[PDB]
Symmetry: C3
Subunit: 214 residues, 3 copies
């Protein structure tokens, strides 16, 4: 398994991040700041365990489609299922979202990952992209509410940069999935795991640092 | 698969509903009303994806019991797992339920569907109905709190009609399950899928319209 | 299956407990007390169904490792997944925890059980204990926040006794798991199920009585 290197590296970098975030957040008294620490640390924390699962090989399954027996890292969708709403919750709390928009974002987020999962396990190669289409659609709703649903200059300036980090990173995920072993098999799993590793550490630890250092 | 027609029809009607609900809820400023839009749209939204899963065939499994190899649409319990608490949350928010009754309803609701799931996958034909019995019991607790746990005339009148819609529809589900391919095999899967389709679109889009138009 | 006796006994004692708790909590008007009733009753309620699942045999799977085909009661982790955060939520609400510490405890709790699950299903005997190590680590964070994150004398005195009940009981779980069929196979499944049964009824009904009678 050639991509083991990017899984091992992902695991460690989610580890280093969880821990640094834990440290940095030793001391916080502020109820609000604690919240931002609870979320931000949990995210790579969970990401760590799941990257570990793929590295050790636990979160890895084969799906028969398109004549091949395709190895699919399911553990990603286990990761993403909890870490993605949490990321949205960082922005939501930041921007003082009404519970109405929180539920919407969280609800739409669950759909996104859920369809992504079903898509990933789909045995009929063509249906894979129907679920891709549904999932992407859900994605556009998030980016929608992020832009057009969502102010002290402190939160605003922090919001706009974290908002921007989200739009660009999350937009890359489907492309990878589409191009990768889940979709077209245009890029090998090796390159795909690398791209997903760059993205995840950027979308979590990267995103994380920007936040908790604000 | 003869019931494909009722799955296809279900899918479309959950689609038309999600979308109409999305539209209708373009504009809402009110924090409370947004909440009611978040929930009400999410419900058939999720229902859509799951009806799609059964139509495409993804949410369909065989369970060996009673000498046969029974096709069980598991995806229903995936649907119901999230859509049912949300329905209860519409009524709860409507009626200003204390968090105590919210947790109770949600908690009891999880049990209901969870036992329903286990029941559906049970390999010993007789145990199927033990889990049916547990699930139904949970159901009676919901209908209990709905009646005897739960006032501006606006919410009350809306509550009593939505409360009534719930009691009658949800009471039908076990009967179908008992009579259907999950339980007795008195009715064929075809008729059962139809009944479940009539119920779901009624319990979601039907229920939905009454609510958001109030 | 020799441990059937401890599963049957567990089932009944979670049953007797759910029901007594239901009764005892007929009448509560207080919003806060209701909360404490919602949680405390839900816990053995869920525990009941899951103990039933292992008794009937539904929540039982074989995992190939260390040359054997080890029967693993997975249903425990289904139980623990919801009942453990609820227990933490009893203490949290009791002690008026900020949402920051609630999320942290709940988040860390999910990790604990999740890794425990993965560990339990791990096919490489040695990795089992890596996940054991991760899970335990998560545990120490809970006991940490319980001691050093967490006052009318009423809640305090109740908190310190329930806090103590938690530390001692929950500390036993890994030891059992380590010694038992999940880990070392030092103790037979029979003895292990007994120990887990003593613990669960103590950590739930036992813990429960102390709380709702306060
Ligand atoms: C920490 C992990 C993050 C931020 C992951 C985000 C992943 C997505 C936004 C992926 C969404 C997907 C689609 C839009 C299409 C179908 C495939 C999914 C999972 C990749
Ligand atoms: C949108 C979907 C809804 C409102 C579904 C509701 C389903 C139930 C209330 C079903 C409960 C069940 C029992 C009471 C017994 C065992 C079988 C279950 C799932 C059908
Ligand atoms: C009602 C059930 C309760 C309170 C169960 C608590 C279980 C734990 C605290 C177990 C944690 C585990 C570890 C610390 C190591 C790996 C095995 C797990 C599940 C046993």
């Amino acid at each position: 398994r050639p991509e083991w290197i990017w899984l091992a590296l992902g695991t460690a970098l989610m580890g280093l991040g969880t821990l640094y975030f834990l440290v940095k957040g030793m001391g916080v008294s502020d109820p609000d700041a604690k919240k931002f620490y609870a979320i931000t640390t949990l995210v790579p924390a969970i990401a760590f365990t799941m990257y570990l699962s793929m590295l050790l090989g636990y979160g890895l399954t084969m799906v028969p489609f398109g004549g091949e027996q395709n190895p699919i890292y399911w553990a990603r969708y286990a990761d993403w299922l909890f870490t993605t709403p949490l990321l949205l919750l960082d922005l939501a709390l930041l921007v003082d979202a009404d519970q109405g928009t929180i539920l919407a974002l969280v609800g739409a987020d669950g759909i996104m990952i859920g369809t992504g999962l079903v898509g990933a396990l789909t045995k009929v190669y063509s249906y894979r992209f129907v679920w891709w289409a549904i999932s992407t659609a859900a994605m556009l709703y998030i980016l929608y509410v992020l832009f057009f649903g969502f102010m002290r200059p402190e939160v605003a300036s922090t919001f706009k940069v974290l908002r921007n980090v989200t739009v660009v990173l999350w937009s890359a995920y489907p492309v990878v999935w589409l191009i990768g072993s889940e979709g077209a098999g245009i890029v090998p799993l090796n390159i795909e795991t690398l791209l997903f590793m760059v993205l995840d550490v950027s979308a979590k630890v990267g995103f994380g640092l920007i936040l908790l250092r604000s």
